[PDB]
Symmetry: none
Subunit: 89 residues, 2 copies
């Protein structure tokens, strides 16, 4: 049971988050900046992205998944499986 959400960004600004892909390939949100688009949007560290704009990303190569995200322009659509960053409270 995932949780979808869409991010709105300014033209010259960025969504404000970073991500990390990892083999065993899987990618999650490693960090979110304050007052960022992703923060407001409610993106959380530890959270896995199952698919961007339908396009299921579960597996893809970093560089590859990166493009799609960047290529999405100033509006992004995400469905995520909750994750957690241990230092977080």
């Amino acid at each position: 049971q995932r949780k979808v959400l869409t991010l709105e960004k300014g033209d010259n600004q960025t969504f404000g988050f970073e991500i990390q892909t990892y083999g065993l390939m899987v990618t999650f949100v490693a960090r979110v900046h304050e007052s960022s688009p992703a923060q407001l949007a409610g993106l959380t560290p530890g959270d896995t992205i199952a698919s961007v704009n339908g396009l299921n990303v579960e597996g893809i190569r970093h560089r590859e998944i990166v493009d799609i995200i960047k290529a999405s322009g100033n509006v992004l659509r995400l469905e995520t499986l909750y994750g957690t960053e241990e230092s977080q409270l």
Copy 2:
């Protein structure tokens, strides 16, 4: 890909790095190397951030949780041996 590295440091000092552990889904735990302080054994050893710590002193730390990695590192004293796996803003 496993990049081995070994650090040594003294009583009243620290290896110089910080870690982050994520509990993921597809719960899988994963530990990365966060900050790596300047003038630190970790630096000299060439450890680099973003790396996935897969092995600590010969024990496998994947799937293991933060405080366990943290305990295993504390158990060996002034010497530490890591095996790391050889990140983009949006």
